């Protein structure tokens, strides 16, 4: 409706995307603490997190509550099709489901679009690992 006024130093697109990412990241953290409150003292995830032996509070949160927003190059899922992310969506859909908010937990299991967008975000992490495993001794070798 053009009722949104831009923040100084940000474009209206940056203003919009900032506001949407705040809402959805707050929801991820609000649901995640609600999950951590649910866990009994017997809970074996909590036993391993609180010991610090393995896992963290976000792993609990993603298993139990919400996997959350999927990102590529730090942004929400790109319109790789013309004005849409997949043929299943209509054009100009900026909503959370369209742009890769996985509102399900790993226990509930992902919907098909969420599964693909979670594969897109997971590919970036696989590429970055391949890059940094190419540099393991690079600066050490040059400095020595």
Partner 1 sequence: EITPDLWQEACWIVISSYFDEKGLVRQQLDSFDEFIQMSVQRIVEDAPPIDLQPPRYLLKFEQIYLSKPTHWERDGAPSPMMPNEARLRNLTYSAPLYVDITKTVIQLQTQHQKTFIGKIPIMLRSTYCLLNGLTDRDLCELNECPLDPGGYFIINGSEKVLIAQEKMATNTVYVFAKKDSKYAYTGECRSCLENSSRPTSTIWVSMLARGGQGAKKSAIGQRIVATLPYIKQEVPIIIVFRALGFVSDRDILEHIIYDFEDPEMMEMVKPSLDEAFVIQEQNVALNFIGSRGAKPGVTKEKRIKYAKEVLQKEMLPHVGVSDFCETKKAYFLGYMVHRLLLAALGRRELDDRDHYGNKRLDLAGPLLAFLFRGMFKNLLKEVRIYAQKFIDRGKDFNLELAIKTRIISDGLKYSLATGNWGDQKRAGVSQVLNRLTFASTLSHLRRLNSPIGRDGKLAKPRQLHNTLWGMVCPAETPEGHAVGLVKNLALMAYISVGSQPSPILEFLEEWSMENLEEISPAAIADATKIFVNGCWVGIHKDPEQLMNTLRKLRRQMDIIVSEVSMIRDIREREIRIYTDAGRICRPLLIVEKQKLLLKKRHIDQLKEREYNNYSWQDLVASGVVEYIDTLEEETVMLAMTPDDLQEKEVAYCSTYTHCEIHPSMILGVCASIIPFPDHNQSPRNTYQSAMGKQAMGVYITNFHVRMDTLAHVLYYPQKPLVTTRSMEYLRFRELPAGINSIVAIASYTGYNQEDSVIMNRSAVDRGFFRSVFYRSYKEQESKKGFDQEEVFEKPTRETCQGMRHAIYDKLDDDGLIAPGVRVSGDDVIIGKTVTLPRYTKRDCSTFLRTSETGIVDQVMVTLNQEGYKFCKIRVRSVRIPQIGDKFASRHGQKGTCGIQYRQEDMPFTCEGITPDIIINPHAIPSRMTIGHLIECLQGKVSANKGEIGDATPFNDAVNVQKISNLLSDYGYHLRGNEVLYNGFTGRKITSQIFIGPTYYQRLKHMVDDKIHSFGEMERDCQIAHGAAQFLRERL
Partner 2 sequence: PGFVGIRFCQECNNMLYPKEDKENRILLYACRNCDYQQEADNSCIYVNKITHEVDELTQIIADVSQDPTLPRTEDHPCQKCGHKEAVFFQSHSARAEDAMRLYYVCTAPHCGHRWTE
Which residues here bind partner 1, judged by CB under 8 A? 44-45, 48-49, 53-56, 59-60, 62-63, 72, 77-82, 85-88, 90, 106-107, 109-116, 118-127, 130, 133-134, 137, 140-141, 144
13 binds, among partner 2, partner 1, none (CB under 5 to 8 A by kind): partner 2
122 binds, among partner 1, partner 2, none (CB under 5 to 8 A by kind): partner 1
**Helix runs in 1-144, H state only:** 12-38, 44-50, 57-64, 112-132, 138-143
Q: Given the complex with partner 1, which of 37 and 131 has the nearer CB atom?
A: 131
Pairing of strands 71-72, 68-69: unpaired
Other Cβ atoms closer than 10 A to 124 = 14
Instruction: Classify the C-alpha dihedral 87-93-95-100 as positive or negative.
Output: positive
- Taking a C-beta distance cutoff of 8 angstroms, is the pair 10, 17 a contact? no
Q: Given the complex with partner 1, which of 17 and 124 has the nearer CB atom?
A: 124
Phi then psi dihedrals of residue 81, to 5 deg = -80, 170
**Least distance CB 11 / partner 2 (angstroms):** 5
Q: Given the complex with partner 1, which of 24 and 104 has the nearer CB atom?
A: 104
Beta pairing partners, 81: 84
**Least distance CB 48 / partner 1 (angstroms):** 5
Beta pairing partners, 84: 81
Q: Which residues in this chain contact partner 2 in the complex, by CB under 8 A?
A: 1-2, 4, 6, 11-13, 16, 83-84, 87, 90-93
């Amino acid at each position: 409706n053009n009722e949104l006024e831009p923040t100084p130093g940000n474009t209206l697109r940056q203003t919009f995307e900032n506001q949407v990412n705040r809402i959805l990241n707050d929801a991820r953290d609000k649901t995640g603490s609600s999950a951590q409150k649910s866990l009994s003292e017997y809970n074996n995830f909590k036993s391993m997190v609180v010991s610090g032996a393995k896992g963290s509070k976000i792993n609990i949160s993603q298993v139990i509550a919400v996997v959350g927003q999927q990102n590529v190059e730090g942004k929400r899922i790109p319109f790789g099709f013309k004005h849409r992310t997949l043929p299943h969506f209509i054009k100009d859909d900026y909503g959370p489901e369209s742009r890769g908010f996985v509102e399900n937990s790993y226990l509930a299991g992902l919907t098909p679009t969420e599964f693909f967008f979670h594969a897109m975000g997971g590919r970036e992490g696989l590429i970055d690992t391949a890059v940094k495993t190419a540099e393991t001794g690079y600066i050490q070798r040059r400095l020595i």
